[PDB]
Design a protein around this ligand. Structure first.
Ligand SMILES: Nc1ncnc2c1ncn2[C@@H]1O[C@H](COP(=O)(O)OP(=O)(O)OP(=O)(O)O)[C@@H](O)[C@H]1O
Ligand SMILES: Nc1ncnc2c1ncn2[C@@H]1O[C@H](COP(=O)(O)OP(=O)(O)OP(=O)(O)O)[C@@H](O)[C@H]1O
Ligand SMILES: CN(C)S(=O)(=O)c1ccsc1
Ligand SMILES: CN(C)S(=O)(=O)c1ccsc1
Ligand SMILES: CN(C)S(=O)(=O)c1ccsc1
Ligand SMILES: [Mg+2]
Ligand SMILES: [Mg+2]
Lengths: 272, 286
């Protein structure tokens, strides 16, 4: 017997089998299941994934909230008209502990995989589990974590997963700072300097009519004008994060530490 | 693309079989998957027959040999490859779908994202071949995603592989039932295996000791674990030209749990260059 589901209300499930049963039952009645994976502490950047999933016709939106090893989140989801929240415990997700896992390809060792070399094996493992529990038609990730998003597209391709991955543009504060729960830690001087990441990327994207080296030098000049911004990398790559082609489309990515807080941003770049 | 029911439909492209499987499920057939490396014998046919008997079933048998569960030199080029006979046998069994993908369609990006099995993959068969089961589980996960069966069928013969596939299914929340099928044996007890063709007549005679050792241990086991193991060892020791790689009695999940009342006894041995495996359920003090 299918667990209880009330159309038009926020239905909260903690057991993986429950959300699985509901989602199978809902898909059979002709709803298209949209999955929006999060770690809770919801802000406007997360709600833009939610809004994107909501506008697919016939959608029922599943928002998962899970931290790799609350009332207000759920209120935000209600206010958004989300009908399902999936809130599993660690034990529900890892009942046999850490056993079979996904091993990413070599892209996971680069860029964010520098400081955190097993970070993405962990992310891909839980993404794959969520896809299998929920079996959505489409799954939504923010472009803010671009390398994560490209890794998910590789997971999907490589394991023949039948789900469409939708990347959602980065939501920004008024001065361009990419929204993130970490921003709250920045003191005023760090918060003022943090604008340099987005300002450097946008400067680079306009300078790119003059070519790839003009785009990189414009970005570096902007970051060089900020105090207390320790750049960990600034790299222009093609859109799948391979090496940047001579011309055409790419992606410019930056990560920097301001005090103890690490910030990331990236932007589409059209070369020449 | 096309699906002619009651006939064998062969697809090579993953998209084709995924499309047909999905259409079939939607019309309410239940999809059964039997993964093979081809070279089909009666052991594979027991899997097929178990799949066939699930009411409403449509049976997909896949045939695919890696470049990932093999680990050089060496072996990958050594695998028996008769696709011909295989399809004929499947037609005979009334299978409706054979899935025979190319290496290119399975690995268009080489080895990029893969499955990392848990620590069981480093033991037993994995001892000398510590990448072998990452190869197997990566293909089985892809087959499960392409075909999305209701049930997938594996033989008990490759018991460690069966356990690993159950771990993969649990650990990734895969929505498929794994059905283990009992080992099919020649009349003298020898477990059927495509590798048995590499035994010359003397080695074929000697190879009965694996199954004789195991069944002797299963009966001996009223006298305890040590008696069962020594009975198996004695039989294997009496066998000319059988060289034992391992003989081990484990818990049923092969797992990090001590042995209690129920066990599996596993053996691997070389007869010249041919490596043979077998295993049996063991009840201690029963
Ligand atoms: N500003 C943003 N715009 C678009 N998507 C975002 C934004 N911030 C987070 N996301 C997306 O939300 C999903 C959940 O992200 P997660 O729950 O880590 O939050 P986060 O803001 O990146 O928090 P943290 O600062 O702790 O890293 C991911 O797909 C992520 O890329
Ligand atoms: N004798 C048997 N009884 C039941 N199942 C079997 C038997 N032999 C193989 N199988 C199963 O058939 C499936 C396909 O196996 P595969 O194509 O490796 O054949 P194989 O006979 O084991 O070949 P090889 O001898 O080359 O290892 C696996 O699930 C395997 O456990
Ligand atoms: C990508 N994440 C937001 S996720 O829900 O799949 C996750 C990853 C590690 S914890 C939660
Ligand atoms: C102090 N920072 C606000 S800053 O104005 O000096 C800065 C920010 C990005 S470049 C210079
Ligand atoms: C377990 N196999 C028979 S499979 O079809 O998943 C496979 C694995 C490596 S080659 C074929
Ligand atoms: Mg984040
Ligand atoms: Mg085999």
């Amino acid at each position: 017997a299918i667990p209880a589901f009330h159309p038009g209300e926020l239905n909260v499930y903690s057991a993986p089998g429950d959300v699985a049963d509901v989602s199978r039952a809902l898909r059979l009645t002709g709803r298209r299941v949209m999955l929006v994976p999060t770690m809770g502490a919801l802000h406007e950047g997360h709600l833009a994934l939610v809004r994107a999933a909501k506008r697919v016709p016939g959608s029922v939106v599943v928002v998962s909230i899970f931290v790799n090893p609350p009332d207000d989140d759920l209120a935000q989801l209600r206010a958004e008209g989300v009908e399902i929240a999936f809130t599993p415990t660690t034990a529900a997700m890892y009942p046999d502990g850490l056993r079979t896992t996904v091993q990413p390809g070599p892209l996971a060792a680069e860029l964010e995989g520098g400081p955190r070399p097993t970070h993405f094996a962990g992310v891909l493992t839980v993404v794959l589990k969520l896809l299998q529990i929920v079996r959505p038609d489409r799954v939504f990730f923010g472009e803010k974590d671009y390398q994560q998003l490209v890794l998910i597209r590789q997971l999907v391709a490589d394991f023949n997963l039948d789900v469409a991955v939708v990347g959602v543009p980065t939501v920004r504060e008024a001065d361009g700072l990419a929204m993130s729960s970490r921003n709250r830690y920045l003191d005023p001087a760090q918060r003022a300097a943090a604008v340099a990441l987005s300002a450097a990327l946008t400067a680079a994207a306009h300078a790119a009519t003059a070519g790839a080296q003009a785009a990189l030098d414009a970005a570096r000049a902007v970051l060089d004008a900020a105090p207390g911004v320790a750049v960990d990398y600034l790299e222009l790559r093609d859109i799948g994060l391979g090496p940047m082609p001579l011309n055409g489309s790419g992606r410019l990515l930056v990560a920097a530490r301001l005090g103890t807080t690490r910030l990331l941003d990236n932007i589409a770049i059209e070369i020449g």
